[PDB]
Amino acid sequence: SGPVPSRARVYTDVNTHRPSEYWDYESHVVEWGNQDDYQLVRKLGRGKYSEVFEAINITNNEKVVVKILKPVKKKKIKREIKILENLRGGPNIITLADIVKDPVSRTPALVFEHVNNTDFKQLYQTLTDYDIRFYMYEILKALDYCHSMGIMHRDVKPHNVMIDHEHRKLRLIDWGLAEFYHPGQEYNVRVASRYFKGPELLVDYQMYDYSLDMWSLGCMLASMIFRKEPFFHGHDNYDQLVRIAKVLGTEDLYDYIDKYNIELDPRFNDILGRHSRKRWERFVHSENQHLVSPEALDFLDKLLRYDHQSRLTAREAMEHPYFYTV
Amino acid sequence: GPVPSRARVYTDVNTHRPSEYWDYESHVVEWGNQDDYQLVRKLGRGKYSEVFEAINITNNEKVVVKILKPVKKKKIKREIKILENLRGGPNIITLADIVKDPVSRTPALVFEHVNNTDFKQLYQTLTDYDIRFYMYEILKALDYCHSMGIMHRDVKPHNVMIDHEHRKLRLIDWGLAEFYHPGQEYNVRVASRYFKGPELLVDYQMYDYSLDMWSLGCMLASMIFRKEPFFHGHDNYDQLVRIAKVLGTEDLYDYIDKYNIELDPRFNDILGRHSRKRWERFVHSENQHLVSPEALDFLDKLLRYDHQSRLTAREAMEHPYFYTVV
Ligand SMILES: Clc1cc(CNCCc2ncc[nH]2)ccc1-c1ccccc1
Numbered sequence: 001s002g003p004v005p006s007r008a009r010v011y012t013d014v015n016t017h018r019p020s021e022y023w024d025y026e027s028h029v030v031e032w033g034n035q036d037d038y039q040l041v042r043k044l045g046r047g048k049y050s051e052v053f054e055a056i057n058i059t060n061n062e063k064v065v066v067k068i069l070k071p072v073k074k075k076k077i078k079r080e081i082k083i084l085e086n087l088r089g090g091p092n093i094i095t096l097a098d099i100v101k102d103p104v105s106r107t108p109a110l111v112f113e114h115v116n117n118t119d120f121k122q123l124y125q126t127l128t129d130y131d132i133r134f135y136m137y138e139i140l141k142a143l144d145y146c147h148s149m150g151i152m153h154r155d156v157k158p159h160n161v162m163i164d165h166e167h168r169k170l171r172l173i174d175w176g177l178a179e180f181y182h183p184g185q186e187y188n189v190r191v192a193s194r195y196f197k198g199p200e201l202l203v204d205y206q207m208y209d210y211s212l213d214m215w216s217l218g219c220m221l222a223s224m225i226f227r228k229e230p231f232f233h234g235h236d237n238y239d240q241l242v243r244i245a246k247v248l249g250t251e252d253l254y255d256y257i258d259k260y261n262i263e264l265d266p267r268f269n270d271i272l273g274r275h276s277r278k279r280w281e282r283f284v285h286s287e288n289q290h291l292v293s294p295e296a297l298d299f300l301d302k303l304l305r306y307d308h309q310s311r312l313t314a315r316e317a318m319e320h321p322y323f324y325t326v
Numbered sequence: 327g328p329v330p331s332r333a334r335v336y337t338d339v340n341t342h343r344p345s346e347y348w349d350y351e352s353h354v355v356e357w358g359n360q361d362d363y364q365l366v367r368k369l370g371r372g373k374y375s376e377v378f379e380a381i382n383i384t385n386n387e388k389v390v391v392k393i394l395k396p397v398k399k400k401k402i403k404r405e406i407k408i409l410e411n412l413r414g415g416p417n418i419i420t421l422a423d424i425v426k427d428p429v430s431r432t433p434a435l436v437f438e439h440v441n442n443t444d445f446k447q448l449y450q451t452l453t454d455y456d457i458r459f460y461m462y463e464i465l466k467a468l469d470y471c472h473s474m475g476i477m478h479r480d481v482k483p484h485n486v487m488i489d490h491e492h493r494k495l496r497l498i499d500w501g502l503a504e505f506y507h508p509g510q511e512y513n514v515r516v517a518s519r520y521f522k523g524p525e526l527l528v529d530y531q532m533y534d535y536s537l538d539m540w541s542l543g544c545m546l547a548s549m550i551f552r553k554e555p556f557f558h559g560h561d562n563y564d565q566l567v568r569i570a571k572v573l574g575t576e577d578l579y580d581y582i583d584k585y586n587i588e589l590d591p592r593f594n595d596i597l598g599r600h601s602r603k604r605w606e607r608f609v610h611s612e613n614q615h616l617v618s619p620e621a622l623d624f625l626d627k628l629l630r631y632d633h634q635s636r637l638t639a640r641e642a643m644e645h646p647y648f649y650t651v652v
Contacts, residue, residue, distance in 0.1 A: 029494075032414030034473045036339065101414055103474060104347045 004260045007183040008209035010313040015150035015180050023150065023180045025082035026075060032101040035109060038066055049073075050176075054114070057097075063114035064097060068107055076176065077108050083151055083178045084110070090149070092142040094162070094173040112173075118165040120158050124227075126165075129291045130325060132224050135163065135170055137318065137326045139217060142172035144314035147210040150181050154191040156216035158223075181209055192216060194240055195230035199253070199306045202241040203262050211308040214317070218303030225296050227288040238267050248306060249277030256306035295322040329586045332508040333472075333534035335638045340475035340505050348475065348505040350407035351400060357426040360434060363391055369442075374401075375501065379439070382422075388439035389422060393432060394501075401501065402433050408476055408503045409435070415474070417467040419487070419498040437498075443490035445483075454616050455650065457549050460488060460495055462643065462651045464542060467497035469639035472535040475506050479516040481541035483548070506534055517541060519565055520555035524578070524631045527566040528587050536633040539642070543628030550621050552613040563592045573631060574602030581631035620647040 015023045037059050044052045049070040057064050069077060084096035098111035139161060146153060153160075155177040162171040177191045186206035192198070198215035200208040222231035232247065234240025245253050250272060257264055280297040299322035302312045312320065340348050362384050369377045369390065380391040394402055409421035423436035464486060471478060478485075480502040487496045502516050511531035517523070523540035525533040547556040557572065559565025570578050575597060582589055605622040624647040627637045637645065 030414060031416040033416070034470065036473065103411060104344055106410070106413070 003205060003207070003262055005184060006205075006207045006209070006260065006309065008181060008211065009309060010315065011147050011150060011181070011210065012183050014148065015182055018150070022086065023182075025079040025180075028078055028082045028085075030078060030081055030099060032108070033098050035100040035102040037098075038064065038100065038111065040066060055111075057111075065112040065114050066100075067110045067112065069109065071108050080176045080178065081110070083175050083180075087146055087149060087151065087175075090142070090145040092138050092170050092172055093145065094171045094175070113171075115162040115169070115171050115173075116164045116166070118163050123163060123165055124224075127224070127291070129225075129293065129296075132221070132291060132296075133323055133326050134168070135161075136217070136221060136224075137323050138170035139172060139220075140314050140318050140323075142170075143210075143213050143217065144318060146172070146178075147181075147213070147314055151178055152181050152208075152210045153178050153213050153216075155193065155196075156213045156220065157193050157196045158220060159193075161220075194234055194237065195219060195232055197237070197240055198308065199241065199244060199256065200308050202237055202244075203257055203264060205260055205262050208308060210313070211311045214303055214311045214314065215305075215308070217317075218300060218311070221296075221300055222283075222304060225288065225291045225300065226283045226285075227291070228283065238265070238271060241268065242271050242273070244306075245272060245275050247278050248304065250275045252277065252306050259307065293322075295320070295324075298322070327586065328530060328532070328588070329584070330509060331530075331532045331534070331585065331634060333506060333536065334634060335640065336472050336475060336506070336535065337508050339473065340507055343475070347411065348507075350404040350505075353403055353407045353410075355403060355406055355424060357433070358423050360425040360427045362423075363389065363425065363436060365391060372499070372501075380436075382436075390419075390437040390439055391425075392435040392437065394434065396433055405501045405503065406435070408500050408505075411474055412471055412476065412500075415467070415470040417463050417495050417497055418470065419496045419500070440487040440494065440496045440498075441489045441491070442487045448488070448490055452549070452616075454618065454621075457546075457616060458648060458651050459493070460486075461542075461546060461549075462648050463495035464497060464545075465639050465643050465648075467495075468535075468538050468542070469643060471497075471503070472506075472538070472639055476503050477506050477533075477535045478503050478538050478541075480518065480521075481538045481545070482518045482521045483545060484518075486545075519559055519562065520544060520557055522562065522565055523633065524566065524569060524581065525633050527562055527569075528582060528589060530585060530587050533633060535638070536636045539628055539636040539639065540630075540633070542642075543625060543636070546621075546625055546628060547608070550613060550616045550625070551608040551610075552616070553608070563590070563596060566593065567596050567598070569631075570597060570600050572600075572603050573629065575600045576602060577631050584632065618647075620645070620649075623647070 037057055038055045039058050041054045041056060044054050049072050051068045053066045055064045055066040071077060081099055087093045088096055095113035096110060097113055100109045100111055155174055160174040162173055179187060187208060189201040189204050189206060192201060196216040196219045198212045219231050223229045232243040234243045280301055284292045299320050305311045362382055363380045364383050366379045366381060369379050374395045374397050376393045378391045380389050382389050396402060406424055412418045413421055420438040421435060422438055425434045425436055480499055485499040487498055512533060514526040514529050514531060521541040521544050523537045544556050548554050557568040559568045605626055609617050624645045630636045
C-alpha cells in the first residue's frame with residue numbers, strides 16, 4: 001500500500017504536549033531590531049543563501065557574527081529564527097543575540113555570539129584521541145538538548161560545528177535546515193549535505209526523526225578517527241547510498257528497505273550492485289591507528305546503521321564506554 | 327526669530343542614510359490586487375481613512391484593511407514608505423500589502439490583524455502592573471521608530487491597539503508620521519488636541535521625537551489618574567491653558583524664553599497665571615491603586631514644557647517605574 005510508518009524512540013511527543021505557539025514557526029511574530037547598533041568589520045564567508053560577517057556591537061564594544069540572509073524563502077527564515085529562539089541558551093548551541101534588518105536594504109540578518117574558530121584542517125593535525133571524545137561529547141550535549149526540545153538539526157557536518165580549541169568551546173550552528181519533530185510527519189528528504197545524508201534520505205523515506213543527526217555524527221566520527229574526509233564520498237545522492245553500501249553491505253540495505261516497505265528509485269538498480277559488510281578495523285592504518293580503539297569502533301558501529309531506529313540516541317551515545325574518559 | 331533645536335538622540339540617523347530611505351516622494355509604490363481580500367465589517371472611520379476587518383481568501387487569515395481617501399498622494403506615499411521602513415519593528419503594526427480596488431482605484435493598506443480588547447472592560451480591570459507593562463510595550467515601538475528616524479506625531483489611546491488575551495500591543499495609524507531631519511521646521515497641525523505637545527500649541531516648528539514623549543505622558547497621566555483626557559482643551563489655544571493649569575505659567579515663560587518663541591496674541595486674555603501643581607493632587611480613591619512615587623516621578627519627567635528636557639524613549643525604558651517589567 002505504501003511505506004511502513006516509524007517514530008523516534010526518544011522525545012517522541014515533546015512537541016505534541018507543548019502549546020501551538022512553540023512549534024508553529026509560521027505564526028511566530030518576528031521583531032527586527034535596528035541594524036545601526038552593528039558595524040560590519042569583514043566578510044567571514046559566503047554560503048548558498050547567506051553571507052556571514054564579523055561585526056562589532058557599537059552599544060557595548062562586543063564582537064558579534066552577522067549572517068545576512070538572501071530572503072529567498074520567508075517560511076525558512078521564520079523556522080530558523082523560531083528554532084534559534086527556542087534553543088537560545090542550550091548547551092553548545094550558537095546564541096542568537098539579535099534579529100535585525102538594515103533600513104534601506106530591508107534584508108533579514110541574524111546576529112550571533114562571536115566564535116573564534118579553529119580551522120578544520122588545523123585542528124585535525126593536533127586532534128588527540130581524547131580530543132575526538134571530548135568534542136564528540138560536546139556535540140552530543142547540543143543534540144541531546146535540541147532533540148529534547150523536539151528539534152532535529154538535519155545538517156550535522158564539521159562546517160556547522162564551530163570550535164575554539166584554546167577555550168575548549170564548541171557551538172553547533174547553521175540551524176537553517178532544522179525542523180520540529182512531530183511523530184508520523186513526513187519530511188522533505190532534500191536536507192543535510194550529501195556526505196552526511198542518512199540512508200533514509202537517500203532512499204526517500206520521509207518519516208525520519210532525530211536519529212538522522214546520529215547518522216551524520218557517525219559520518220563525522222568515522223572521518224575523524226580514520227582520517228578519511230569525507231568517510232562516504234558520494235559524487236551525487238544516488239552514488240552516496242552506493243558509497244555507504246560499499247561499507248555497510250547490500251544485505252542489510254535490503255533488510256532495511258524491506259522492514260519499512262521502501263520503493264527503491266529505478267536509478268538505483270543499475271549502480272547499487274552487491275557488496276559484503278566490511279569490518280571497521282579495515283580502515284585502520286598507520287596514519288590513523290593512534291585515534292582508533294575498540295571503544296571508538298564499537299561506538300561508530302552503533303551510529304552507522306541503516307536502520308534509523310537501531311542507531312544510538314544522543315543520550316545512549318553519551319553513556320557509551322567511548323566517553324568514560326570525559 | 328526662534329532659537330533652533332535638535333533631538334538629543336538619533337539626531338542624524340536620516341542624514342547618514344541614502345536618499346531612497348527618507349525620500350518618500352521618490353518611493354515606487356506597487357499596488358497589488360484587492361481581490362485576495364474580502365471585507366467583513368467596519369472597525370472605524372478616521373479623518374481621511376476607513377478601517378475594515380477582512381479575510382485574506384488565499385490563506386483564510388484575518389487582516390486589517392485601511393481604505394484611504396486619496397486627498398493627498400504625497401501623504402499616502404509618506405505613510406507607505408514609513409510603514410515599509412518600520413515593517414517588523416517591535417509593536418509596530420505590520421503592513422502586509424498595498425492594494426487598490428480594481429474598479430475604485432482607491433488606495434488601501436493591508437495590515438496584520440490585531441484583535442483589540444474592548445476598551446471599557448480593559449479600563450476598569452486594569453492594574454498598576456498592566457499599565458507598566460503596556461507602557462513599556464509602547465516605549466519599544468517609539469524607541470524603535472525614533473531610531474529609524476521617524477516620529478509618530480499621533481500618539482494617543484486610539485492609535486494603540488491592544489490584544490489583552492495575548493498581551494499584544496501595536497502602535498498604528500502612521501499617516502501623520504514623519505522623517506526627522508535636524509533643523510527642519512515641521513507643520514504644527516499634527517497629533518490630536520489632548521495629546522498635542524506645548525511646542526505645537528506655541529507654534530514652535532523645530533520639534534523632534536520628544537513630541538511623542540509628551541503625548542505618551544498624556545496617556546500615562548490619563549491612565550494612572552483615571553481622567554480622560556488628562557488635559558481637556560476645547561481648542562488649540564485653550565489646550566495650552568489646560569497644561570498651564572497643571573504645569574504652571576512660570577515654567578511656560580521659561581520655555582518660550584529659552585527658544586525665543588513668539589506667543590500668539592490669542593494667548594493674552596486666556597493664559598492667566600497658574601501655580602505649579604504637585605502630581606499628588608490628582609490622586610483620589612478611585613485611582614490610588616495605580617499611582618506610586620515611581621509613576622509620579624516618571625510622569626513628571628515626561629510632562630515637561632521643554633521638549634529637550636523630556637526623557638527619550640530609551641531613558642524612559644530605564645526608569646524605576648519599569649523595574650517590575652521584563
Ligand atoms: Cl493606549 C491604550 C489603548 C487602548 C485601546 N485602544 C483602542 C484602539 C482602537 N480601537 C479601535 C481602533 N483602534 C487600551 C488601553 C490603552 C492603555 C493601556 C495602558 C496604558 C495606557 C493606555
